[PDB]
Amino acid sequence: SVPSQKTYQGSYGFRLGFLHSGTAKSVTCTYSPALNKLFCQLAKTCPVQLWVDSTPPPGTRVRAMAIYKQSQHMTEVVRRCPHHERCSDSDGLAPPQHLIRVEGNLRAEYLDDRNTFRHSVVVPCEPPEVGSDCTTIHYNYMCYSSCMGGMNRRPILTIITLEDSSGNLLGRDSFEVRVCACPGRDRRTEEENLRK
Ligand SMILES: CNCc1ccc2c(c1)c1ccccc1n2CC(F)F
Ligand SMILES: [Zn+2]
């Protein structure tokens, strides 16, 4: 009824990482460690790093799913709003209803869960390129937090799960997301609010 959001490193030491993009007015994606919250513009690249302490088995996958953060909305499926689901911005692979897309990965698979109706996107877990210490997935969020008839100003969390080839849990991490026109200003505002 509600997916778990419990952080779980598991046997492989799985956890996320984020770049340090700053809060300039021109920034398109920026992560707040103090808030555990990503702020991003609509349909812009969101780099999320995947870190492990040891190599998981061949066939391991990485899934992303959004849920509402507030308990009174958590059973409602997070989906694109009535406008954006109809705006014909398909990449040829993501269903138009899905909020979260993976950019530039032809092996991405999009699931409409037959029992919960929730959306998710899953990719094979690949090792870092030679010379790199982590792997990066590029996500896009395809509606604003404010979209009426969709998220409607309700905060969401993205849950990232490391899964075996059957879909069993190997690791889990999560972060809040706000999709907004000015992520740098909004991060600054929310960090100052938290500090006060
Ligand atoms: C020093 N660098 C460690 C590191 C970090 C991330 C890594 C791996 C190794 C690794 C090895 C095999 C397959 C996937 C791997 N990942 C992606 C996984 F975190 F999602
Ligand atoms: Zn929308």
From Swiss-Prot:
Effect ascribed to mutating residue 6 to R: In sporadic cancers; somatic mutation
GO cellular component, one term: chromatin
Reported effect, residue 37 to Q: In sporadic cancers; somatic mutation
Effect the entry attributes to changing residue 15 to C: In sporadic cancers; somatic mutation
UniProt-reported outcome of changing residue 133 to Y: In sporadic cancers; somatic mutation
Outcome when changing residue 187 to G: In LFS; germline mutation and in sporadic cancers; somatic mutation
Protein name per Swiss-Prot or TrEMBL: Cellular tumor antigen p53
Organism in which the protein naturally occurs: Homo sapiens (Human)
Name of the gene encoding the protein in the UniProt record: TP53
Full protein: residues contained: 96 to 291 of 393
